[model samples]
Target chain A: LSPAELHADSIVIDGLIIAKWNRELFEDMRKGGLTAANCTVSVWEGFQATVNNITASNKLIRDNSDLVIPVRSTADIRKAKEQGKTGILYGFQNAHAFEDQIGYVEVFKQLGVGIVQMCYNTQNLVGTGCYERDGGLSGFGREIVAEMNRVGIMCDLSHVGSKTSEEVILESKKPVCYSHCLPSGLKEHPRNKSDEELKFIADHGGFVGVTMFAPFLKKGIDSTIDDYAEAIEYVMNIVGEDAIGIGTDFTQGHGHDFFEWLTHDKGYARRLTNFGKIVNPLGIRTVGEFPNLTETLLKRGMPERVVRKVMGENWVRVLRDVWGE
Target chain B: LSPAELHADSIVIDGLIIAKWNRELFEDMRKGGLTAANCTVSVWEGFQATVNNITASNKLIRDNSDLVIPVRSTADIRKAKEQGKTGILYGFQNAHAFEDQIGYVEVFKQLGVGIVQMCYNTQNLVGTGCYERDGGLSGFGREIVAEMNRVGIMCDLSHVGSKTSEEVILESKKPVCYSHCLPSGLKEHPRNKSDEELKFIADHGGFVGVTMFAPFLKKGIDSTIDDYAEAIEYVMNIVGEDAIGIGTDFTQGHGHDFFEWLTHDKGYARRLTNFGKIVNPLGIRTVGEFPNLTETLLKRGMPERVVRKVMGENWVRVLRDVWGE
Candidate 1:
């Protein structure tokens, strides 16, 4: 079968997509043939502010009903696939939205959130992020993980610190994930996971979703879909085919001001880092260009079954395991 | 000089007092001849609620200006001593009031907060309290300790966990303290500090303020002023006389409803522990019975100089050092 036919037949899911929410982005997801995505609704926002963000996203989804559907469970993702719509699964890049309340875990889950990162790029009540010195998880953090487990929300650790990420992998009863990340073995960066990190997570009933964020790629901005496939292949060698998936950290339709907010601690406190000259890899630059990834992976000699799992099947299975559906 | 003469001549500082704030409490503070006290204004409350508590405390201090004066500096404490009025130095038994903002440390300091405990009997964003499993200080907690040092607010570890307390002691450039605690040598309670723990804080240039809360006393409710003096002497032998001071955990005028709030995590969640009966030591049952402590220390063969230091002189010196006065 051709690459396009293979892509068209698979249940393609993007494990992470923090794009600026609008009808255009929803249309872009459809153009990319994305059946579902973990759409980020909170980062560096407190409980009330995050709820407001969710309300705004809910409005966007409602207005773009032709292109998107809200997803609360794995069944919804399948439904979105059948209906030919992109399922928007509400997620938080930082669990700061839960504030200090353990009860807020179930509250967010009830409000349609299914995935949450413990921290963004700095310290939160739960744990420290990748930007600063890591002090594993807190006692309150343990309680939060328990609550998240109880409420069926998958814990994401892509931006979490090394120590914290390892601890979360061990602490979680359900499988946790790095929803969007690259391999430091290709090009060492704070946001990139090491060879041992990828293995450790997969060894402990966890999943790894390889990301193609330009700064962490081997050839960086000058690279194409080939570099993204290399990262996915490198991670797959360690995490195995069953646990590998895709999480394109695509910031589509966002501007400099949004990047400024994302790069700072608590959206405005201290500056964390500068990802100079923001650009996605060449062939898969936009969400609309997502088909290039499947073709590239197939050209790179990945088996059809592995390509299907890397595209979305593994994500659906892990989401089902965590969501208990 | 007589014990009474020494007590009258020396500065008398209470390191911890969470009594119900009122005109009567102010009158008792004056009766106790307290030069200044670390009076708790916040516990298990967030920023706005803590500010409200300070407002209420301010009103109480205003109405009883003849009996007590607000102390923002050690100079104010000295002024209160000269004016024959009790000095009320705003404090918190928990740093929960600061919430998640590092900037709020200075904000609370500007609002007349002098001493703030890192946690109160359970986990908060800062650290875990003694009632639960302790994961040491967090990355944000380290930032908080730095901010507290910069703002000159003493970090109290009275109810904070052992690991967190040790970390705070090591982390603080300014002297951190157990503002109100008894020696676990006298009784094996979670709230009581062990012999090595007392020495550890003192070895790090920190302070230890002994409490006579009966539940943790050797004889429980039947313990007297002698028992308190014995406990103080035991700690002073380890921490030295220069590091010892009074911190009577006086919860005068509060009812059982208050204890219910104190025992629960976040004032509503899990119950940490239950003190079956609430009582102070026999001879030092109320704040007004404070002079009996000086008398008991003298009878227990404590030197007049040591008695003066334990009663309040040591506290004044340490407070001035931390307050930069």
Candidate 2:
């Protein structure tokens, strides 16, 4: 089958997306042929503020019902594709919203959040993020992990610290994911996972979602869609085709203010990181250009079935396993 | 001047105490001849709840002003002794009371909180407690330590983990303290500090307030005030006379339900510890029997000056250094 035919036929799921939520972004997702995507509604927000973000996003999805539908299960992804709509899977970039209450897991799950990252870029109540020396998961963190497992919310460790990530992997009975990460083996960076890390996660029935954030990419901003493909292939080699998928870390409609908020600890307290200039890989810079990624993977000599799985099918299967749907 | 005379004459300060706050406890403080004690007002509670606790404690001190006075400084401690009132220096067993805001540190300080432990029995936003594996002082924890130092509030590490305790000891420009801990050299327990740990804090200008929690004592329930004094002397050898003080983890007036709450994570999650049977040592079974500790130290042949310092003078001086009063 041709690249376009394969992309259209597969249940393409973007593991993570934190774009400026608007009608325009939903339109772009529809244009990109994304069957489902775990879109972030919380990062640096407390319980009420996060609920406000989710409430707002819920309204946005409702307002754009013709183009976008909310996904609480893998069945929703399939239904979205059948209806020719983009599936919206609510997610949290930081578990700060859980706010010392383990019951918040069920609260957010009931609110339609299916995936949650343990930390963002600094220490929180649950655990430490990637920017600092991690102390590992706390007693409360272990309980939070168990509740997430019980409630079927997929734990995302992409921005979590090494020690904390490892502990979460050990503590969680359910499948966790790097949801969005690059390979340190390809280019050393704090945010990038090592080869052993990739294998360890996969060995324990976990998943990896390759991110093409320009700063951590091997070629930096000079990278193209082909380089993106190479990183995915490198991660795929370690995690295997069935455990790998795409999590572009797309900040397509966001600007400097959003990046500033993302880079700071607790959104305003202290600066944790500064991404000099964010230019997504060439030919796949916008969500509308996502078709280029599948095309690039196909041209790079990956098997047709493997390309389709990497695009989104693997993510769907794993989400089904985690969400119990 | 004998040890008994010096102990009676000195302005004795218990660096930490978390006994159930009531008239009976205040009566016991007088019976023990405690000039002042850093009585805990918060643990496993958030900002508002802690504020409520402090408010209630303030009211209690007010109602029983003849027996207890709210101590905000070393001068207040001295004043309480002069007035023949047992000074109640408000404190928090966990920084969780500060919640996510750093400003709460100053708010509580202004409300008469003279000392605050960085973590309790588990993790909060700041650091991990002794009941779990510690990561270290978080970025927020560092900021809180700095603020506490600036505001003249002592940072206590009694229930903090070794890594986090060590980091706090190194991080605080002002002297921090293990307001209550046993020596692992005498008995190997997670709550007991190793010789290196005891010495490391002292070497860094930190203080050690010896605790006689029966479960952690070498002799357990079989221990007496002499055994408690022996543990204190063992720690004093490493921390030195100038950095040693008293902080009996007296749970007087508290019941099994309170322990049940304290042992569980976040007061209601998975259990962290079980004391088996909550019992203080034989001679100093309650806060009322505290003077027996001084009498025992005196009989043990500790010099009058050293006995006075160990009883409370050391804590007063070190607290003045940290509290800037």
Per-residue alpha-carbon lDDT of candidate 1 for residues B1-325, written as tens digits (9 for 90 to 100): 8878877887888988888877888888878778899898888888898999999989988888899988999899889999999998999888878777888999999999999999888766677789776767865678889989998999999999998889898889988889999999979999999999999999998889998888888899888788888898899989998898999989999998999998866776667788879878888888988888888888888878888899888998888889897
Worst 10 residues of 2 chain B by lDDT: B1-10
TM-score of each: 0.91, 0.93
lDDT of 2 by residue, B1-325 (tens): 6545665677777767777877888888887789988888888888888889878888897888889887888888889879888988888889988877788889988888888999987877888878777777889889999988898888888889888888888888999888889999989888889998888998898889998888999989888888988898899888888989998888888888999988888888888888888778888887887777888898998987898899888988987788777
The numbered model that scores best in TM-score is: 2
Top-DockQ structure, candidate number? 2
Model 2: DockQ vs. true structure: 0.61
Candidate 1: stretches off by over 4 Å: A130-134, A162-167, A268-274, B1-10, B121-124, B127-136, B161-167, B185-190, B194-197, B271-276
Q: Write the per-residue lDDT of candidate 1 for residues A111-209, one digit (tens) a residue.
A: 999999998887666777797767678656788899999999999999997987888888999999999999999998899989989899999989999
Candidate 1 residue A36 C-alpha distance from true site, Å: 1.7
